[PDB]
Amino acid sequence: ARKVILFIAMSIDNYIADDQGAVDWLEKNVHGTESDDSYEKMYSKIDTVIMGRTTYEQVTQKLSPEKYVYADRQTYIVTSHLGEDTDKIKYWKQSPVELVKRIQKEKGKDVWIVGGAKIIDPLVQANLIDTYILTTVPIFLGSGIRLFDRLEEQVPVRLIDVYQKNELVYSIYQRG
Amino acid sequence: ARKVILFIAMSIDNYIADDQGAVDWLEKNVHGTESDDSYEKMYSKIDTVIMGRTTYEQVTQKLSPEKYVYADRQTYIVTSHLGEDTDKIKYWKQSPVELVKRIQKEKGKDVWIVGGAKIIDPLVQANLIDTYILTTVPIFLGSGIRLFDRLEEQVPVRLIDVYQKNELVYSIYQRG
């Protein structure tokens, strides 16, 4: 099966960025220099990334230093904006839930839901995430963009594992 | 020094109770029967509990089956209600921050901040919590009473430890 994965960092108070969409205060609050392999491990298992228009713009600008960081995967951009599709990038004007259900009926590997909250929240509400890798950073941010603001459904999950690297808590949950 | 401790359970989405103030869906989502000693350990170190009027009423009714569960400690009830003080219970009409600063200048042991969010949030904003024992339950609640809703200050903390019992994540942070 094509597993749907959420791998994201957030503050103790469940903010993923500040007011501006900046992540620098989350990055500032890592304590230590030890390696973690969650990202490389997850990334090796996916063939597809799904994200909204703002996250796409942020990643292409701020994260990609020499070319688009996820050029080596299939990208869906879930947006009402009418962009130009390519062999590697597809603009999706329907709901994220409809995208994920269609993908799951297709041949392939795993799928990473990158962000933002408008993409992620409906997929959790729909119980369509298979694996949650949630990284808590040792900071109360006090304001900003909150993830899981108000899902309006109970979604029970199961704890697979938990550990700490550089004072970050890595919590790994699975769909019940 | 008199350390100020927060020991509370919440969902992945940072809810501490439902809409009604009920905690039964958090309790329902524990998976396993192994013992944990965090509560007894913390409780042994305190001489004082501080809580708001609703939490006091809930604990005296729902948690105390044969007499007030925290009768063996000094209780502060932070409320504008004019209750009747006793040798073991004191009604505090000023801010929770003023209470904690005064207590800290006095002789004694540690202090537990029980709840609710109106008591806890200002104390975190003020950086007055020394130890955080935060227990995440494997559930998105989707609505209810949220803790750390909007502290409006950055509060960096340090991860002391993290572990799992019965699929609950116990994260222990210390004041920076």
- Specified resolution (Å): 1.9
CB contact under 8 A, B157 and A139: yes
Contact A78, A99 (CB under 8 A): yes
Q: How far is it, in rounded angstroms, from Cα B96 to Cα B118?
A: 9
Q: Which amino acid is at B43?
A: Y
Q: What are phi and psi of B24, to 5 degrees?
A: -65, -35
Find the CB nearest B142 among A154, A158, A169: A154
CB contact under 8 A, A25 and B158: no
Strand order in the sheet with A110-115: A89-92, A74-78, A46-52, A110-115, A4-11, A131-137, A168-175, A155-165, B139-140
Experimental determination technique: X-ray
Q: In terms of DSSP bridges, do strands B74-78 and B131-137 run parallel, antiparallel, or are they unpaired?
A: unpaired
Q: Which amino acid is at A106?
A: E
Instruction: Name the closest residue on chain A to residue B168, using Cα atoms.
Output: A159
Instruction: Name the closest residue on chain B to residue A161, using Cα atoms.
Output: B164
Q: How far is it, in rounded angstroms, from Cα B30 to Cα B165?
A: 9
Interacting residues of B61 by C-beta distance below 8 A, sequence separation 6+? none
* E-only strand ranges, chain A: 4-11, 15-17, 46-52, 74-78, 89-92, 110-115, 131-137, 139-140, 145-146, 155-165, 168-175
Distance from CA of A122 to the nearest CA of B (A): 11
Give chain A's count of helices (H) and strands (E): 5, 11
Domains of chain B: 1-176 (3.40.430.10)
Contact A138, A19 (CB under 8 A): no
Distance from CA of B142 to the nearest CA of A (A): 4
Instruction: Name the closest residue on chain A to residue B26, using Cα atoms.
Output: A156
The string of DSSP letters for B149-176 reads S---S-EEEEEEEEEEETTEEEEEEEE-
Interface of B with A (CB under 8 A): 12-14, 25, 29, 31, 124-125, 134, 136, 138-143, 148-159, 161-164, 167-169, 171, 173
